[PDB]
From a paper:
[name], a subtype strongly associated with disease, functions as both a fast-transmitting Ca2+-permeable [name] at sensory synapses, and as a Ca2+-impermeable receptor at cortical synapses. Here we present cryo-electron microscopy structures of the Ca2+-permeable [name] homomer, which substantially diverges from other AMPARs. The [name] extracellular domain tiers (N-terminal domain (NTD) and ligand-binding domain ([name])) are closely coupled throughout gating states, creating interfaces that impact signalling and contain human disease-associated mutations. Central to this architecture is a stacking interaction between two arginine residues (Arg163) in the NTD dimer interface, trapping a unique NTD dimer conformation that enables close contacts with the [name].
[name]-G–[name]-γ2 determined in the apo state diverges from existing [name] structures in its sequence-diverse NTD tier. We also observed selective interaction of the extracellular [name] β1 loop with the B/D LBDs, while the other [name] pair targets the A/C KGK motif40 through their β4 loop. These contacts are conserved in apo and active [name].
Residue numbers in the entry:
A (entry chain D): 485 to 533
B (entry chain D): 632 to 729
C (entry chain A): 534 to 554, 570 to 631
D (entry chain Z): 6 to 39, 57 to 83, 94 to 162, 174 to 210
E (entry chain D): 779 to 781, 789 to 828
F (entry chain B): 583 to 631
G (entry chain C): 779 to 780, 789 to 828
H (entry chain Y): 6 to 39, 56 to 83, 95 to 162, 174 to 210
């Protein structure tokens, strides 16, 4: 608005906005107990029961 | 299959493990300060009272902070610049959400 | 881990004189090594520990064997599928 | 019996010496770093280039717990301590030939030293993951094997002593 | 465009569990032996 | 004994001598590797056409 | 507003297991009742 | 002997009370709903914070059979009923000391109760598929464990009674 009050703007030749930039997700170091990952925690609990 | 932690604005708003920041002085800063939308209200509240300060001197500093933070920092910036940086080496950053 | 498990099984099975009162069981060092090898291969039919401590050792060895062998098969399948 | 005691003492000394050398020396791993270097539990030394022979303390610093346990090297040192205690028990057994629980204590110490050696090896390798292995790593492994064999010998000696008492 | 051998770190937890179980078995056996020894001494 | 070991179906008797136990253990290792390879390659076949 | 295997994938086998346990208890108790009745009438 | 009666009665009361509290309370699952963080039980869901904090709302439970079973909560309630009947059998065994079949009955009830518990859990979690777990869920789990232990005790006591009678 401030600029438009002193100069004439054409229509937007390219539209943009505010966006979020994050580091690309990468392979995570396996956890100590990652060998339980294939089954859900509920499966293990019900197996014990 | 690698899944990003953040997928939208509200995802950033909900969590607190990942910090986010903008330029110290720029259009994004005023947009967040002056906003009237609850999600951006809570983002502005988090950002203004963030210790240490999440704001950066320049865009390059924000990009470097994102790259070196091991995914614990998210930079809010123009979509065009975000896309451009995403397509440049070392190709370790990407744009999320709308 | 195989060596350690076999040694600990022998120790907990045979050390105490209050059970000798012929040996209390069949778990010498040689028989402990045989039991551990068969357990890892998932083949043993011969003897299992009867004491609480021997059964703890056997159970943890069994869990280790299960996880390791499932991991081997799964990673081999992954190799072949990816190629 | 004399042969068994001689073997137990020699094996205990061998395992203790091997573990002590493995902990003290700096040839656990060969890898590229600061350019081809050999590193132990504490130091990294360049074996080629201008700075050949220059050693630098390793910069160690759930993940924090692993890094702390690796930096302290609690488990290799605990294995050395347990081997020393087992050797002390074996030595003291001669002075007190009627107290048969000293042999049992020595056997327990040797088995526990082997177990802590296993834990230390696993922790070291896992911390490194986050190349090649040198002669001190295999000194530690050989120490583990000898410690387990000596523990088996000590337990056998305890059993034989109690069998003789029964008969 | 937007378009292997599993290591010890993948299975470290099961090794820790195994060694902990070995230690627990040793402790249980030793506790029972000590209890029986004191009982024998008293009797 | 060899057939039961290969099929992973237990055993009536097991060798008690050092040499018999060497034979049994090496046969068990062979069986483990071969059966795992069969299952893995069958999975690879069924996954990718 | 707008990996792991879940228990819903393997719920049927849990149901089968618990049903089999109930059936086993039922069979054992029926046999016990029959034998006890036979004992009483003798 | 009396120690076994005491343990069985105490465990029966503990399991019954734990199951009743778990069925009655609302802290089974922590999730997000009506948006806002909420804690929900078998019947009600309440808001943990926001402008409606403290307000509770009946859960809208509507395979049709799974939905009906989950909504009725037939299996947790059946477990509570079976625990009550087992406690009644234990109490009655005091007055009729020569009727051993009461003790057996008690054991059976407890075992059955445990099994019912299992099914309930399996249903509950399954119904959630179509977060975190609160202390009511773990109260139910502990109730299952104690019920199984008390059933084992009661069966052992029946066996001991019949062995004494046999001699």
């Amino acid at each position: 608005l401030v600029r438009e009050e002193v100069i004439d703007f054409s229509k937007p030749f390219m539209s943009l906005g505010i966006s979020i930039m994050i580091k690309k997700p990468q392979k995570s170091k396996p956890g100590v107990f990652s060998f339980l990952d294939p089954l859900a925690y509920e499966i293990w609990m019900c197996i014990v029961f | 299959r690698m899944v990003s932690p953040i997928e939208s604005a509200e995802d950033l708003a909900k969590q607190t493990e990942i910090a986010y920041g903008t330029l110290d002085s720029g259009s994004t800063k005023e947009f967040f300060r002056r906003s009237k939308i609850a999600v951006y209200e809570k983002m502005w509240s988090y950002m203004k009272s963030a210790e240490p300060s999440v704001f950066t001197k320049t865009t390059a500093d924000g990009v470097a902070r994102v790259r070196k933070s091991k995914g614990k920092f998210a930079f809010l910036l123009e979509s065009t610049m975000n896309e451009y940086i995403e397509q440049r080496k070392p190709c370790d950053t990407m744009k999320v959400g709308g | 881990a195989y060596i350690g498990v076999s040694v600990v099984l022998f120790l907990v099975s045979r050390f105490s004189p209050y059970e000798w009162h012929d040996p209390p069981n069949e778990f010498g060092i040689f028989n402990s090594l045989w039991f551990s090898l068969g357990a890892f291969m998932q083949q043993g039919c011969d003897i299992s520990p009867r004491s609480l401590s021997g059964r703890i050792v056997g159970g943890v060895w069994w869990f280790f064997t299960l996880i390791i062998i499932s991991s081997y098969t799964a990673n081999l399948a992954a190799f072949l599928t990816v190629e | 019996r004399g042969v068994q005691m001689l073997l137990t003492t020699v094996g205990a000394f061998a395992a203790f010496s091997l573990m002590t050398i493995a902990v003290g020396t700096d040839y656990w791993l060969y890898s590229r770093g600061v350019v081809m270097t050999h590193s132990g539990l504490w130091r990294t030394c360049c074996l080629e280039g201008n700075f050949k022979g220059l050693c630098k303390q390793i910069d160690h610093f759930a993940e924090y717990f692993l890094r702390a346990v690796r930096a302290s090297s609690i488990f290799p040192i605990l294995s050395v301590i347990l081997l020393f205690m087992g050797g002390l028990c074996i030595a003291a057994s001669e002075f007190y030939k009627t107290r048969h629980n000293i042999i049992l204590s020595a056997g327990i110490f040797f088995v526990s030293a082997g177990l802590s050696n296993i834990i230390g090896i696993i922790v070291y390798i896992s911390a490194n993951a986050g190349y090649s292995y040198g002669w001190s790593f295999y000194f530690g492994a050989l120490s583990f094997i000898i410690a387990e064999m000596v523990g088996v010998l000590a337990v056998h000696m305890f059993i034989d002593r109690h069998k003789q008492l029964r008969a | 465009a937007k378009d292997s051998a599993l290591s010890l770190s993948n299975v470290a937890g099961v090794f820790y569990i195994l060694v902990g179980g070995l230690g627990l078995a040793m402790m249980v056996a030793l506790i029972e032996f000590c209890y029986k020894s004191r009982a024998e001494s008293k009797r």
